[PDB]
Amino acid sequence: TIPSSITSGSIFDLEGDNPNPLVDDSTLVFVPLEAQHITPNGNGWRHEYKVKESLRVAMTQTYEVFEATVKVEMSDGGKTIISQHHASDTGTISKVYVSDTDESGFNDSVANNGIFDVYVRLRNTSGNEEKFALGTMTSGETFNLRVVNNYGDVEVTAFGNSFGIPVEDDSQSYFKFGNYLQSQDPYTLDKCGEAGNSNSFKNCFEDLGITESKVTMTNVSYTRETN
Ligand SMILES: [Ca+2]
């Protein structure tokens, strides 16, 4: 069953209340094309869980392990973030993607062919992002995800493939997971729409032909300790 940290919101705030991702006691369904929930400065719609502000400490002060069985159903050309760490100023620390773009450097890297690259970006201690391909999948396939933050040493495992490095520290860091559908052209990689304007993303997704986006998570666990 889904743990209380999520189902009672003891650790995680729900980002995107309607519909609720908890469809039964053992399943989370994330549908941002329905939730249509934004951040104040992002490009896209999300349906996700987020470690509440009142629990946040530094990356180097947290030990956390998130694990889930993850099924992804998404339109060709779609790009989503299924888990991520952010710094107090909103800055990216880690992001795990499932995307069907032509960004180079992954196993597929072919725009809009229905073969999704699954990869991770991690911000190293020098402030630079490093990226690593973990695998590929097609819409409707399932894989197992593990995200470990070992006091600032971040490791991501998908398809049994692992990559990890020490990341740039920040004072009030937080973890999110779910389905953060990015409003972004899979060819030029240009972001589309206007931050803070939900209606702008409606149109981006429409014209990009992104009308399918459902991430289903089961066998979910989350462990957290602070030092
Ligand atoms: Ca592709």
Domain ranges, ordered by start, for the chain? 1-227
Resolution of the experimental model, in Å, one decimal: 2.1
Buried b (16+ CB within 10 A) or exposed e, 186-220: beeeeebbeeeeeeebeebbeebebeebbbbbbeb
For tokens 């450097």, the residue is: 105
Count of other CB atoms within 10 angstroms of residue 89: 8
Task: Give the type of residue at 5.
Answer: S
Residues near 207 by Cβ (< 8 Å), separated by ≥ 6? none
d(CA 217, CA 68): 6
CA of 113 to the centre of ligand 1 (A): 5
Structure token digits, residue 114: 């229905």
Residue 223 CB neighbours (<10 A):
12
For ligand 1, the distance from its centroid to the CA atom of residue 138, given in whole angstroms, is 9
Q: Which backbone phi and psi does 213 adopt, to 5 degrees?
A: -165, 95
> What tokens does 214 get?
């459902």
Distance from residue 114's CA to the centre of ligand 1 (Å): 6
Distance, CA 166 to ligand 1 centroid (Å)?
29
Q: Which of 208, 203, 217, 218 is nearest to 36 (CA)?
A: 203
Read out DSSP for 25-93?
Answer: TTEEEE-HHHH-B--SS-SEEEEEEEE-GGG---GGGEEEEEEEEEEEEE-TT-EEEEEEEE-TTS-EE
Q: What is the DSSP letter of 186?
A: T
Find out if CATH 3.10.450.200 is the number for domain 1-227.
no
Contacts of 42 (CB under 8 A, 6+ apart): 180, 195
Ramachandran angles phi, psi of 71, nearest 5°: -105, 130
- Per DSSP bridges, beta strands 213-226 and 62-74 are antiparallel
